[PDB]
Write a protein that binds this DNA or RNA. Structure first.
Ligand SMILES: [Ca+2]
Ligand SMILES: [Mn+2]
Ligand SMILES: [Mn+2]
Length: 430
DNA sequence: ATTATGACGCT
DNA sequence: AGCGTCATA
């Protein structure tokens, strides 16, 4: 009862850009705006691989991982933008730089955790406390929440989407106890006000639209964000969790989309997150381990303590290329030439990183895949990274992998290489 | 023949 | 350390 922790201590948001690489290309090229369009890498093989899709194109059934030739079968008027190619490979610099634009704006409001190229978590607990003091017990107007959905509302005793949104928001605001500076629901609401401001700032200063989730932890914030996309934000309260989770497939929760999630389903014979509540903590720990079990026991009740880490910059800088089917590398000079290409992009990114962010990478990680291996990586070896020089890094990379060549002939490489990967790690301040 | 990443857990 | 899992454009 009174000692039951409810995991309502924090206000956490997740902000995720809408169709991000597509918006970067649509900003650049006005002809692509408000059209079915997608972003593709490479072109020779089946028109290239789709990696981002506008909402207009999704309506035709176009998805990520689809070959553009196949996407065109669903959407004959689909417009395409190509990922840049440099040194023989896809180069994602434009999208990394656009990401920095957004992350720098978000950082003005609070400490952020960069979680991908297009999303960051925000711990708004302190910002909310500050804003609550400014508000002075004054009610929150619906006008301050013009793109916010309250999950689970409206309920109880109009037919268009925006109408429904306002109905739910009204019920929510009508219920709010604004006299209590410590009410979690009030704190979430003020959190949502700030995120409206954050999202307006991102759109004003970059042109990019985004969605967001506001809740008491990262998992719920992420889940909330996806509930009303694009260009909207969703508040998931603690109270909304039982109904929300009662029909929520387990795989939809972050970290449960893979083998662990499948094992939760199979071992326990359940389908929905809410069904987890009927197991003891020890029962869950017995099946899924101490850490996972405790996490599941709290998470199915809407509770999670994973902090928003203060980290705005990626921890590693990597360059990778696949060589599928017949393009697999079978000669030493092939292997060496491509290691050099990767190393040259890596040097360029590392040198920029050092100037921008006052740090230096100290370890070089080299990974390859061999033809036949089911695994994405076959072998991973590290060596020292002492100088930002591509010729040295590629020579060093070759040295640490050259023993994988089973071929009796030095000139030939066997089995052929279907992937190369260079990653700079272990940064130190500089 | 999705590809190019990037964080974190296990032993 | 090297490998595996899970994640996003
Ligand atoms: Ca996104
Ligand atoms: Mn994302
Ligand atoms: Mn996505």
């Amino acid at each position: 009862g009174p000692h039951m922790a409810t995991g309502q201590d924090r206000v956490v948001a997740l902000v995720d850009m809408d169709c991000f690489f597509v918006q970067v290309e649509q900003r650049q090229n006005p002809h692509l705006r408000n059209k079915p369009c997608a972003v593709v890498q490479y072109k020779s093989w089946k028109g290239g691989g789709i990696i981002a899709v506008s909402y207009e194109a999704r309506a035709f059934g176009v998805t990520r991982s689809m070959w553009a030739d196949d996407a065109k079968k669903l959407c004959p008027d689909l417009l395409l933008a190509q990922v840049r190619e440099s040194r023989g490979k896809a180069n994602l610099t434009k999208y990394r730089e656009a990401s920095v634009e957004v992350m720098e704006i978000m950082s003005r409001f609070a400490v952020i955790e960069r979680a991908s190229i297009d999303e960051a978590y925000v711990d708004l607990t302190s910002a909310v406390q500050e804003r609550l003091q400014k508000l002075q017990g004054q009610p929150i107007s619906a006008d301050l929440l013009p793109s916010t959905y309250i999950e689970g509302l409206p309920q109880g005793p109009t037919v268009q989407k925006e109408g429904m949104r306002k109905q739910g928001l009204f019920q929510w605001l009508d219920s709010l106890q604004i006299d209590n500076l410590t009410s979690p629901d009030l704190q979430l609401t003020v959190g949502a006000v700030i995120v409206e401001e954050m999202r307006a700032a991102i759109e004003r200063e970059t042109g990019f639209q985004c969605s967001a989730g506001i809740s008491h932890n990262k998992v719920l914030a992420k889940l909330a964000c996806g509930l009303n996309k694009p260009n909207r934000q969703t508040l998931v309260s603690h109270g909304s969790v039982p109904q929300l989770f009662s029909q929520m497939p387990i795989r939809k929760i972050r970290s449960l989309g893979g083998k662990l999630g499948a094992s939760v389903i199979e071992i326990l014979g359940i389908e929905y997150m809410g069904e987890l509540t009927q197991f003891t903590e020890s029962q869950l720990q017995s099946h899924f381990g101490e850490k996972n079990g405790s996490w599941l026991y709290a998470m199915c009740r809407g509770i999670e303590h994973d902090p928003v880490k203060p980290r705005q910059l990626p921890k590693t800088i990597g360059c990778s290329k696949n060589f599928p089917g017949k393009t697999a590398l079978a000669t030493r000079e092939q292997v060496q030439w491509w290691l050099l290409q990767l190393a040259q992009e890596l040097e360029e990114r590392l040198t920029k990183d050092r100037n921008d962010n006052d740090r230096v990478a100290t370890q070089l990680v080299v990974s390859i895949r061999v033809q036949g291996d089911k695994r994405l990586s076959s072998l991973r070896r590290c060596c020292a990274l002492t100088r930002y020089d591509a010729h040295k890094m590629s020579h060093d990379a070759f040295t640490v992998i050259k023993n994988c060549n089973t071929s009796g002939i030095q000139t030939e490489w066997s089995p052929p290489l279907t992937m190369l990967f260079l990653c700079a790690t272990k940064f130190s301040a500089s």
